[PDB]
Amino acid sequence: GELAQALKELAKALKEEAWALKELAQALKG
Amino acid sequence: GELAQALKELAKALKEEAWALKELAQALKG
Amino acid sequence: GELAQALKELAKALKEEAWALKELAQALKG
Amino acid sequence: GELAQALKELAKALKEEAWALKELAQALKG
Amino acid sequence: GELAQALKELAKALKEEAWALKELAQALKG
Amino acid sequence: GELAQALKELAKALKEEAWALKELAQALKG
């Protein structure tokens, strides 16, 4: 239902945020 | 109640944050 | 209730942060 | 209760985040 | 119990993020 | 619960963002 769906969407977004943070860290190192 | 809605908004905002981190990473590369 | 509203406020803050970091990216890129 | 106190802490942190985002926007605008 | 603790952790981390946005703002000014 | 879990994960992500942004701040000063 609605809450389960929203929690799954938040979990996807957290994964995207972590991936993006790694891209920034890489760019900073470069 | 409104918990699921709040989590949907939070997931959407976190996606926007992730995209900004990706844009910063690319900006450091020109 | 109050929990959901505070999470909506947290989402609004991360949305604002995303926007400001996107502007920072545009300024760094030049 | 503990939840109410925690929401209070999050509200304080939101207010600090908001002022720092204002400062970042001020640094960017100029 | 665990939700109030998670919210307190989230407040702490938002304050760290505010500190970092201030540092960005200052760095933009040299 | 699942919610406390996800919010702890978000706090960790905001702490990592704060670290990266402080490194960006130093990079913006050369």
Numbering used by the authors:
A (entry chain A), B (entry chain B), C (entry chain C), D (entry chain D), E (entry chain E), F (entry chain F): 1 to 30
Tell me what the authors wrote about this structure, in their words.
CCs are quaternary structures comprising two or more α-helices supercoiled around each other with cyclic (Cn) or dihedral (Dn) symmetry. Here, we describe variants with all combinations of the aliphatic residues, Ile, Leu and Val, at a and d to give four classes of peptide: the ββ class, with a and d = Ile or Val; Lβ, a = Leu and d = Ile or Val; βL, a = Ile or Val and d = Leu; and LL, a = d = Leu. Peptides are named systematically appending the one-letter code for the amino acids at the a and d sites to “CC-Type2-“; e.g., CC-Hept becomes CC-Type2-LI. In summary, solution-phase data and X-ray crystal structures demonstrate conclusively that different classes of Type-2 coiled-coil (CC) peptides—i.e., based on abcdefg repeats with predominantly hydrophobic residues at a, d, e and g—adopt a range of distinct states.
To explore this switch between assembling open α-helical barrels and collapsed CCs, we tested if examples of some of the latter could be opened by introducing polar residues into the hydrophobic repeats of βL and LL sequences. Specifically, we mutated the centremost Leu at d (position 17) to Glu to give CC-Type2-IL-Sg-L17E and CC-Type2-LL-L17E. However, unlike the parents, they had accessible thermal unfolding transitions. Both transitions were pH dependent with stabilities increasing sharply below pH 6–7. Neither of the L17E peptides bound DPH, but both sequestered its cationic derivative trimethyl-ammonium DPH (TMA-DPH) with μM affinities suggesting that the barrel states are accessible. Surprisingly, the X-ray crystal structure of CC-Type2-LL-L17E overlaid almost perfectly with that for the parent CC-Type2-LL; i.e., all six Glu-17 side chains are completely buried within the core of the assembly. The experimental and computational data correlated well: For CC-Type2-LL-L17E, at pH 3–6 experimentally the peptide was highly thermally stable, and simulations showed a mixed population of singly and doubly charged states; from pH 6–7 the thermal stability of the peptide decreased, and the main charge states were (Glu-17)62- and (Glu-17)63-; and above pH 8, both the α-helicity and the thermal stability decreased dramatically, and more than half of the Glu residues were deprotonated. Thus, CC-Type2-LL-L17E appears to tolerate two buried charged Glu residues, but above this number severely destabilises the structure. The macroscopic pKa for the transition from two to three buried charges was calculated as 6.8, which is > 2 pH units above free Glu and considered highly perturbed.
